[PDB]
Design a protein around this ligand. Sequence first.
Ligand SMILES: Nc1ncnc2c1ncn2[C@@H]1O[C@H](COP(=O)(O)OP(=O)(O)NP(=O)(O)O)[C@@H](O)[C@H]1O
Ligand SMILES: Nc1ncnc2c1ncn2[C@@H]1O[C@H](COP(=O)(O)OP(=O)(O)NP(=O)(O)O)[C@@H](O)[C@H]1O
Ligand SMILES: [K+]
Ligand SMILES: [K+]
Ligand SMILES: [Mg+2]
Ligand SMILES: [Mg+2]
Lengths: 614, 612
Amino acid sequence: PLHSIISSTESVQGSTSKHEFQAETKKLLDIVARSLYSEKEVFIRELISNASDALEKLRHKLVSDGQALPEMEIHLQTNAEKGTITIQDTGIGMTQEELVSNLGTIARSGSKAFLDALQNQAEASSKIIGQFGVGFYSAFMVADRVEVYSRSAAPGSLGYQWLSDGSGVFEIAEASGVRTGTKIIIHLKSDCKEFSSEARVRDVVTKYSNFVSFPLYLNGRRMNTLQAIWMMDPKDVGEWQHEEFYRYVAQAHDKPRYTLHYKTDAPLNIRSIFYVPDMKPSMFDVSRSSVALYSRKVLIQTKATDILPKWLRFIRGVVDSEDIPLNLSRELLQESALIRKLRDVLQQRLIKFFIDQSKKDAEKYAKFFEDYGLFMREGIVTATEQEVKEDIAKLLRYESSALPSGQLTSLSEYASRMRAGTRNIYYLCAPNRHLAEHSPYYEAMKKKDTEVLFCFEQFDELTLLHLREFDKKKLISVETDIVVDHCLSEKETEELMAWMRNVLGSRVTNVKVTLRLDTHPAMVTVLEMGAARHFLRMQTQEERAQLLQPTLEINPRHALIKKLNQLRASEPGLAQLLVDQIYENAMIAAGLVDDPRAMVGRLNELLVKALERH
Amino acid sequence: PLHSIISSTESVQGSTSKHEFQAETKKLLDIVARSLYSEKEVFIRELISNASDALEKLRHKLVSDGQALPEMEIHLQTNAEKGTITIQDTGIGMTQEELVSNLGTIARSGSKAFLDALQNQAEASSKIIGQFGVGFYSAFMVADRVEVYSRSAAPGSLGYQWLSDGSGVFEIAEASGVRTGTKIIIHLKSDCKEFSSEARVRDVVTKYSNFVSFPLYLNGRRMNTLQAIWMMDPKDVGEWQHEEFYRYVAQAHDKPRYTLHYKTDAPLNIRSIFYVPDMKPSMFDVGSSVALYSRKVLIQTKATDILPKWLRFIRGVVDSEDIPLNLSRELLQESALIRKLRDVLQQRLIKFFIDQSKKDAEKYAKFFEDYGLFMREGIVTATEQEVKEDIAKLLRYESSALPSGQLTSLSEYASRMRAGTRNIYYLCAPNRHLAEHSPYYEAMKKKDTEVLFCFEQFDELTLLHLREFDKKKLISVETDIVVDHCLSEKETEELMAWMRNVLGSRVTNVKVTLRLDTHPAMVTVLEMGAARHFLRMQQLAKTQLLQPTLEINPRHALIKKLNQLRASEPGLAQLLVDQIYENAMIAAGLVDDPRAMVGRLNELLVKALERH
Ligand SMILES: Nc1ncnc2c1ncn2[C@@H]1O[C@H](COP(=O)(O)OP(=O)(O)NP(=O)(O)O)[C@@H](O)[C@H]1O
Ligand SMILES: Nc1ncnc2c1ncn2[C@@H]1O[C@H](COP(=O)(O)OP(=O)(O)NP(=O)(O)O)[C@@H](O)[C@H]1O
Ligand SMILES: [K+]
Ligand SMILES: [K+]
Ligand SMILES: [Mg+2]
Ligand SMILES: [Mg+2]
């Protein structure tokens, strides 16, 4: 189907012209006011940012001159009956030239020109928000008529006025009585009268601009009353401010148990603070990042980016940066490379912080791991890189067989003093220390003088089998190692073997003899056990039986096995129930029984007919 | 103190001037090329959309004129030697005035002017994609200089060239040899030569512009070759097209078991199709592949969840030409249209499932067996009572008043109850035999009221969360055991006292029940289902004991033996009573990991039979 008219036959003959790009202002205004912001409340944020920029410019101008500092405040006002919202400022202001150059031209901002002509861009380039030049036109999205009063702080400037309706035309006049600074008056739409209500405005202000750098008022009462401590050095801020900030951000009533104050500028500008709660995690904590992203003291509202890995969703705090790329809508540029490196840097720093906490305090870290271990266990099984899994795995605490009861140990220190020339790590799963010590599998391997890691928590064998390796060493379970490893008369032993294969033929594949058991009359061995256990309870005897191949062993030294001889010689019917009970007990001890409700009736029958002579 | 400085001293006294808004083109171009799109490959989508719009305009003009229709298609070519990407079409083309007025002006689109002068605005308004007027400038995001060779389709037009480096100035000249249509030459940047490779371009084309209305060829081979059946009439489309489309969109090799072809226009313009896979859900299956389209081009938000989370097991495509879009052609967040669409889709899917259940019970039984967990999860995660009750109509249970294996629903159960009765009784067990031989059911065996048997796990939790159906209260059998209002008493009261002193710290109280026939003991707690669920959570994970009561029956043979056992073998008697208590707790379903009781059971087995 190769039919390509693509060629280079084109050739230029006529004289080349020369033109300049134009623009359609009405369509640009319509696009800005209709299809730019997904929410209608952002105009308050934009106006507050503009007021903050004006105040910052005035403050810098006065500081560079060494003059006295007047008051620097933002004043919001709402009039319910008139349906208007008013924001006042005490910044630099602007004359009619700046009025018609900035408010009359799309995508032109004087703040960028101010920053460029500063020659330092250190003291003030970190405190100016405006960079695009279209933020003022969001007021037309909720208004039908905008009215602005302003006058410059220069000694001899006069007031002015600025009216528009968002219809591609604006009129400028000269006004008297204007207070120095800038004042914006907004007349609201019919369908946007909700913004004349004090509660809605307060909610928006607290959601977006709580940490503005200047005092802010709404109808007369100050709303800041709280310093952004993440911008200060740790040596200046006390613990009371830390706990109050944690109380504010976490919406809790307890104290933080861990506090990290992170400030870095080499790879990228990062100023963040992190908290770990004092209570235990709950159902909502497991349910679905609780960390707010900021940029020059303005919320970005990611709510989907998850700048922090999912398994770290239990920590709280704020993250602030100056170099994140944000689009024209003042939202994150989704899945940029900078975000993907910020996440890795932050998670590595958090891992390093958690590792160091163990050294300086052991009991507190043990309690924290007891509380928040499930998050680390989940983080093991969702990562992909082996290095990440090994980094997280250093936080796990286990109980070993070479140490006294009730004290923990780590994998790294487990590998410290293990056998000189064996690249193997052995772990056993049991609900208790008592069940781990007297487990048939542990007895079967107790001959070897190796240290076994007892793990009691749930979803732990799953974590080990997804880890598969630590410091280039294999993680081998005791159950697998037993099969990997390579009295009663023999005539009666073999005859009872034949009988057991006869009776338990359908459920059991093979029977063997074992001298490695001393306190358990039976044991069930499968070629693999951890994966079988995990698979069994996601999904009656048979359809589970051929999926396991339950090899069963017998202990000739046990008393019950010995008595089974003469209880079959005397009454085969009782032995019929006895062997089934032994098999059920062995399968229960192996941990392969999901719901043991089935065996209750047969156990009752065996008990009621076994001792009837007594 | 209330610090307020607001006054109204401002007054105007001069003569108002008049101006109009200007614009800065350099800053606008920088904003478009740098801080508008999250990805760099979207320029191919914009160019293909422009070519499709041009072809649509030419086709409409020719059909309205009534003239013959020539061949029309778009060609996209890749040349890695010069690091260039080229796109060519055979549309209407542009004149010199059209070139200057359209390509040289920001936020001006001729497609809107064409639509406004159509006099019907319905025939072709559903096929024109461009609406903003800034999509052509995304080519400067990956290029340093662009070339445009165009020639209008009018009988007497002349060729032209449109050159620009994206620096804010462009030059236009007259060219010779240009064929009818348009042709765009792109010279890629140093870091953007990734797009001079066939594989990446093919990936982008298949991702974004796979279902365009006109044939396109990449380096000579057709790419789309597949019809978008979600726009065609259901009667015009057969089974083979449905199977092929399903195997494409679902990326599977099986045959769908259910097919819904939804197409409505009254509340909103909707064209959609939904599929149910034949294979069972996997470990991995537990953005849902319901990708949203608009004007036959992918929107690709994949995060707003236009469909409820519990309905993530269905595959298909949803199209809507009235959806609002951002300047970057991404979904507007939380628009009322999105919520209306989600509600309508949920209701329609529920109605479709109900109708499918009515039409064929045998297939619906298998479907419910395969996909039961999703409905329970949706019931648990729902908030509104009507939403919970709508989903609950899809649940199936078997009851005691029916032969084994036959399932029914809550609707018929409510239909066939007595008029006086106002509540529903349900019992949970892993098997029917355990259900009908449960100690709790034997106490409810006296009355003839029907009871629903639940076998699958999380059924108890779902029934607890639902809490009400059709103005009736959902209560369990174990709850009603306590709400409802041969070992003579003398030789028995002291025997319960003996259990009390032996089991002081494990059972709060022990008494005698007479509603038991086959069990030696039975254990009751106040709120059995809730206690069971919390115990399962705690043993599953430490998140943020209880009060058990034990009843015996003086008629069981095994219990009758314990009376004389106290005076003969107390050492055997203690651990035998422990076995009885633990067996009762296991039968109650309140037992944790039962490995702890193996050793004492073995000691019972060894000791109790050292006499035969
Ligand atoms: N209250 C104010 N006082 C003084 N100048 C102001 C005030 N509000 C706006 N301006 C000026 O108006 C210009 C344009 O405002 P604006 O539309 O917000 O652009 P921007 O804020 O710099 N960029 P952005 O807000 O991020 O989209 C600014 O550069 C200021 O010079
Ligand atoms: N291949 C083409 N043939 C003819 N006209 C074209 C072609 N490509 C672009 N144009 C013209 O270019 C104008 C503006 O281009 P464009 O930037 O794509 O705006 P738009 O596609 O109409 N709206 P949008 O794509 O949503 O930004 C269109 O109105 C067309 O008239
Ligand atoms: K501006
Ligand atoms: K244009
Ligand atoms: Mg601004
Ligand atoms: Mg376009």
